[PDB]
Amino acid sequence: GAQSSEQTTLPSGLQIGTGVRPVATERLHSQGNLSQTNNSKDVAIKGQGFFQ
Amino acid sequence: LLNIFDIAGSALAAQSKRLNVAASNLANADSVTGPDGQPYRAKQVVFQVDAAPGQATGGVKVASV
């Protein structure tokens, strides 16, 4: 309703709302640590980029 | 309205008004505000013996909530 400002009054309306649907599943793309495997054919990446 | 019918009907009306006030109280417990914005003051009814002229008894009136 209308707040007259004559009295301190509560702004009472009514809206209920619903639900908490999941909106996204973000992928936190940070540089992981490195682990030495001593294998010659194995390789890791510093910085961004993906093997195709 | 027949006399004893008047007595008992007044009783019915008074008890009904008492119950309505009690229902309003029980429903408006935990009510932050009124319309203009003021506490909801709990309400009670006042019972008085009816038939001011004659016999000093007979019926109940619930004037002045």
The residue of chain B nearest to residue A5, with distances taken between CA atoms, is B36
Q: How far apart are CA B45 and CA B19, in angstroms?
A: 9
How far is CA B15 from its chain centroid? 7
- Using alpha carbons, select from A52, A14, A16, A1 the residue that is nearest to residue B36: A1
* CB crowding A11-43: b at 16 or more within 10 Å, else e: eeeeeeeeeeeeeeeeeeeeeeeeeeeeeeeee
A12 has a chain B CB within 8 A of its CB: yes
DSSP 8-state code for residue A46: S
Q: How far apart are CA A3 and CA A15, in angstroms?
A: 18
One-character DSSP codes across chain B: --HHHHHHHHHHHHHHHHHHHHHHHHHHSS----SSS----------EE--SSSSS-S-EE----
Q: How far apart are CA B11 and CA B7, in angstroms?
A: 6
B33 has a chain A CB within 8 A of its CB: yes
Question: Which residues make Cβ contacts (< 8 Å) with residue B25, sequence separation at least 6?
Answer: B42, B43
CA angle, residues B4, B5, B6, in degrees to nearest 5: 85
CB contacts, 8 Å: A13 with chain B: none
* CB crowding B34-63: b at 16 or more within 10 Å, else e: eeeeeeeeeeebeeeebbeeeeeeebbebe
CB contacts, 8 Å: B31 with chain A: none
For residue A1, the distance in angstroms to the closest alpha carbon of chain B comes to 11
